[PDB]
Amino acid sequence: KSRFFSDVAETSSFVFAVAGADDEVVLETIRLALKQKLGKFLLFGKKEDKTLTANESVTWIQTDTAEAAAQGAILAVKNKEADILVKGFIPTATLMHHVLKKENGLRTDQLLSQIAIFDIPTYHKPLLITDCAMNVAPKTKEKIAITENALAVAHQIGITNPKIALLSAVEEVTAKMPSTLEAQEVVQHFGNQISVSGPLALDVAISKEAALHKGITDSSAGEADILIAPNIETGNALYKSLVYFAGAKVGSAVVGAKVPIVISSRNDSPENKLASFILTVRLVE
Amino acid sequence: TKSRFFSDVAETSSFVFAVAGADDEVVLETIRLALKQKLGKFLLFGKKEDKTLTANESVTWIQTDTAEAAAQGAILAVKNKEADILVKGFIPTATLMHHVLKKENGLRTDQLLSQIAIFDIPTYHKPLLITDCAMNVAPKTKEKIAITENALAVAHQIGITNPKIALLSAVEEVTAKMPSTLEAQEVVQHFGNQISVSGPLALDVAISKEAALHKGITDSSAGEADILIAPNIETGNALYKSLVYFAGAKVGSAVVGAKVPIVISSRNDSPENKLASFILTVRLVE
């Protein structure tokens, strides 16, 4: 069993810029990160936690509003003072409008997408799933971009020759299920350059024996490294089914910009939120 | 104290399954297991008789030389009230469903047919029904109401008196940026106040009380779903497969909405889950 989040503790001198460093839902992860020297922090927030900031690896910047906290963190990224951007205790939209303004140095021509990496007890290696939380109803062009982002992440974190599976509910291509047509078009686009399969139901992507019993013997069968979800509801449900029912550990980040961005859910566990920080450190290095 | 749908002591009955296309071990293996625990009786419409099956008093073999003849034979058995459950065997699904779906043939009403699965998940505290994971591809409001109606019927029939139903999506608020959320709201508004239906809800809030509270959802139904209504077939199917392959769930599934329950198992489900589907259909006749 190969695991992404292993017993070898991650540590770095990369700087996280935290937009809205307030509330324990935000600070709890920063505290855990500091225990293992995971990185350094620029905390833009309204009410300084003096015990937290008494750390050489922490700098506090007083910001009175959500907008000010977002602007501060974004300019730290623009100025190359920060390596990773973290959304704190502010609305996502407040941070995102700054992220998408090209002058701030984060956005390129590339689509942004969410991606997550899972250590699932009952799977034999790490599994990347995208997009579980950002792109709502991607069609062919967007799914191509989502796959490009996943390929880039795969190389950055050391997964060589990743096997990619475009998920659907069936393998037969039919106009009656347009996600199958889109899947086929993504395969047609990459087909000749990398290992991409689909449309595949989940069983075929992650169980070699399930694939055999469907008459599929492709060497990629049951060995997916990356699943590309057909729509956000599927990605989100798959993500959460792994966390709540399969006991998976998971880190997630928004990718496609010049720096990784962390946007955690309100109810993510401390452990999974730390996993997200660890993923982003591995995406910079 | 966890509750499980699939009982420790094998389910038993004298109900009759009509099997359309009783050929090939992928089909026959489930029948062998059912006979082993005396789950029911069988009318086997097929091409090549297996004497190991037919030597059983609970089995009757009917020779049918084509897939069409097998489908029509099994259907007539149901229509004539000789069979309580219809099972698609070694024939194309479309071959059976073409006949099933013609009001003319007497197996359906105006009600939409849907697939539903019931899961015993080790890390969940009670049975969980999910629909539709395999039949309805892109149901909109009207179809989702029908799918929810079918799910309520199943829940009541199996002893869940006030099932908590969650219209599943990726967020908890209605937004025109995600149509499944608008449809969710419409489905909820359709049902009477005596029905415990809520949505849109993401999976975490549907099945984890702690996750719901952390998101400031203090509803009594949050975290305690008995039924999830999938927003589209890809979400339903992926959830079904995730539970089976990653969470070790036992699952039985059936097509409901017609005058009798229908078994349509995939070519790659395990013998144990295929047997679970027979067991569910016996509970839906009872």
Side-chain angles (χ1 to χ4, degrees):
Chain A
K1 176 71 213 274
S2 175
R3 297 176 178 83
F4 186 71
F5 303 108
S6 65
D7 312 326
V8 170
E10 192 55 273
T11 171
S12 86
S13 63
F14 299 134
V15 179
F16 293 86
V18 179
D22 295 279
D23 201 273
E24 202 56 39
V25 81
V26 174
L27 301 180
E28 69 186 356
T29 316
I30 292 167
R31 304 184 200 280
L32 297 174
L34 292 166
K35 292 184 87 69
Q36 64 186 82
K37 305 300 211 178
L38 180 59
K40 304 203 287 181
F41 292 83
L42 301 177
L43 304 181
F44 300 84
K46 313 200 222 84
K47 179 182 173 59
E48 185 178 3
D49 189 329
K50 298 298 212 313
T51 63
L52 178 64
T53 61
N55 186 312
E56 283 177 1
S57 287
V58 178
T59 300
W60 175 264
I61 305 99
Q62 181 69 27
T63 51
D64 273 17
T65 61
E67 274 297 353
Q71 298 185 14
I74 216 78
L75 294 173
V77 178
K78 180 180 182 196
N79 201 26
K80 294 183 270 75
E81 295 167 84
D83 302 286
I84 300 164
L85 175 70
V86 179
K87 196 200 66 153
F89 207 54
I90 63 177
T92 294
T94 298
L95 185 58
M96 193 66 13
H97 85 263
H98 293 288
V99 170
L100 298 175
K101 184 197 304 180
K102 191 156 184 183
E103 294 72 26
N104 289 323
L106 290 82
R107 175 177 78 79
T108 184
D109 53 277
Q110 192 68 10
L111 186 63
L112 302 188
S113 59
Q114 176 274 354
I115 190 158
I117 182 149
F118 296 82
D119 284 334
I120 309 165
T122 58
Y123 197 55
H124 60 281
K125 57 181 181 179
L127 181 63
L128 285 160
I129 311 191
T130 179
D131 180 332
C132 308
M134 181 160 281
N135 290 281
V136 172
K139 301 189 183 191
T140 295
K141 282 280 276 186
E142 292 88 29
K143 277 161 176 170
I144 286 167
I146 285 164
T147 300
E148 290 175 338
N149 287 357
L151 282 171
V153 165
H155 164 64
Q156 290 175 67
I157 69 177
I159 304 181
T160 65
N161 305 319
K163 299 147 187 174
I164 296 168
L166 282 276
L167 294 189
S168 188
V170 299
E171 292 81 41
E172 341 274 301
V173 177
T174 176
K176 290 173 134 67
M177 190 176 313
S179 70
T180 65
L181 302 176
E182 276 156 28
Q184 177 165 76
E185 287 160 23
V186 173
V187 170
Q188 295 168 0
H189 178 264
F190 288 111
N192 282 354
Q193 306 229 337
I194 56 166
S195 175
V196 190
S197 309
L200 301 180
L202 179 65
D203 48 307
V204 177
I206 53 74
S207 168
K208 190 192 291 76
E209 306 214 16
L212 174 60
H213 294 146
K214 268 177 171 175
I216 293 160
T217 53
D218 179 355
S219 71
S220 76
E223 287 289 344
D225 299 288
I226 304 172
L227 306 185
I228 309 302
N231 55 53
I232 194 176
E233 292 94 348
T234 303
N236 197 266
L238 192 48
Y239 180 115
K240 287 165 178 175
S241 75
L242 289 177
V243 171
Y244 290 91
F245 290 134
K249 175 165 200 162
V250 57
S252 47
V254 171
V255 296
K258 285 292 181 177
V259 301
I261 302 163
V262 178
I263 304 185
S264 284
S265 166
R266 181 59 69 97
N267 56 8
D268 288 332
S269 71
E271 293 70 32
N272 287 336
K273 292 183 299 188
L274 179 64
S276 294
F277 279 19
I278 290 166
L279 168 58
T280 59
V281 162
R282 288 168 178 172
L283 284 173
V284 173
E285 67 179 38
Chain B
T1 170
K2 292 151 178 294
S3 58
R4 297 188 185 91
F5 179 72
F6 293 109
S7 69
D8 307 337
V9 298
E11 293 78 354
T12 192
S13 98
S14 290
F15 294 142
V16 178
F17 294 81
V19 181
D23 288 288
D24 199 277
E25 277 309 298
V26 62
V27 169
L28 300 180
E29 70 180 349
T30 313
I31 298 159
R32 297 182 207 278
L33 289 176
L35 293 165
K36 209 183 190 66
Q37 73 179 71
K38 313 300 185 172
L39 173 64
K41 302 178 143 190
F42 290 86
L43 300 174
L44 298 185
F45 298 84
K47 291 184 177 174
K48 185 178 197 178
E49 181 174 18
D50 189 335
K51 303 306 174 58
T52 66
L53 270 171
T54 63
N56 192 307
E57 291 180 46
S58 297
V59 175
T60 301
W61 176 260
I62 302 91
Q63 181 71 27
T64 66
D65 300 316
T66 66
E68 279 293 338
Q72 295 182 47
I75 287 188
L76 178 55
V78 176
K79 192 181 179 185
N80 195 36
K81 309 184 202 59
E82 289 170 270
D84 304 278
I85 301 164
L86 179 64
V87 177
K88 189 210 67 98
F90 201 62
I91 59 173
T93 294
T95 297
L96 183 65
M97 296 303 299
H98 165 65
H99 296 295
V100 171
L101 291 170
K102 54 170 67 178
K103 281 79 180 304
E104 315 143 343
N105 227 337
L107 286 201
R108 70 162 307 188
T109 60
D110 287 322
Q111 188 71 7
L112 183 82
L113 279 71
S114 56
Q115 179 273 356
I116 189 163
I118 184 149
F119 296 80
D120 278 340
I121 304 154
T123 55
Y124 198 50
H125 61 285
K126 64 179 179 176
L128 182 65
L129 285 158
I130 308 179
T131 178
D132 180 328
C133 313
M135 184 165 174
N136 288 284
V137 172
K140 303 306 183 190
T141 301
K142 184 190 183 312
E143 282 129 309
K144 281 167 172 170
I145 288 166
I147 287 160
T148 305
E149 286 169 350
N150 288 348
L152 270 162
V154 165
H156 298 152
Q157 165 70 22
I158 66 170
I160 306 172
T161 67
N162 185 21
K164 297 152 190 66
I165 299 168
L167 280 281
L168 182 65
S169 183
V171 296
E172 291 72 46
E173 299 297 346
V174 180
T175 163
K177 297 185 172 172
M178 193 179 318
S180 63
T181 67
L182 314 185
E183 294 169 6
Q185 163 170 320
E186 296 170 13
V187 173
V188 171
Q189 293 171 340
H190 172 80
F191 282 97
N193 75 336
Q194 75 275 4
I195 304 305
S196 298
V197 58
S198 68
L201 299 193
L203 183 60
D204 54 312
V205 300
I207 50 70
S208 171
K209 175 71 65 181
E210 185 172 350
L213 296 175
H214 287 327
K215 281 179 168 177
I217 305 173
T218 62
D219 286 31
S220 66
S221 297
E224 291 286 335
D226 297 292
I227 302 177
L228 305 178
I229 310 299
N232 53 53
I233 192 164
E234 292 92 341
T235 304
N237 198 269
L239 197 45
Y240 179 107
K241 303 289 173 56
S242 177
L243 292 177
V244 169
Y245 292 91
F246 286 136
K250 183 173 186 178
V251 57
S253 75
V255 169
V256 296
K259 292 176 172 296
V260 301
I262 304 168
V263 178
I264 303 182
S265 281
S266 296
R267 64 214 179 199
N268 69 4
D269 285 297
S270 67
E272 316 88 272
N273 291 334
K274 295 188 293 193
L275 181 63
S277 301
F278 280 20
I279 290 169
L280 168 63
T281 59
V282 161
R283 309 281 206 95
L284 295 178
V285 186
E286 289 183 344

